[PDB]
Amino acid sequence: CEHXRWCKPV
Ligand SMILES: [Re]
């Protein structure tokens, strides 16, 4: 993302 992460099932 931008210093992190979200893009994943749950
Ligand atoms: Re993400």
| Interval between CA 6 and ligand 1 midpoint (Å) | 3
CB 1 within 8 A of CB 7: yes
Method in brief: NMR
| Interval between CA 8 and ligand 1 midpoint (Å) | 6
Token pair for 8: 């994943």
| Interval between CA 5 and ligand 1 midpoint (Å) | 4
| Interval between CA 7 and ligand 1 midpoint (Å) | 3
Residue 2 amino acid letter: E
Tracing tokens 């931008």 back to the chain, one arrives at 2
- What DSSP letter does each residue of 1-10 carry, written as one string? --SS---S--
CB 8 within 8 A of CB 1: no
| Interval between CA 3 and ligand 1 midpoint (Å) | 10
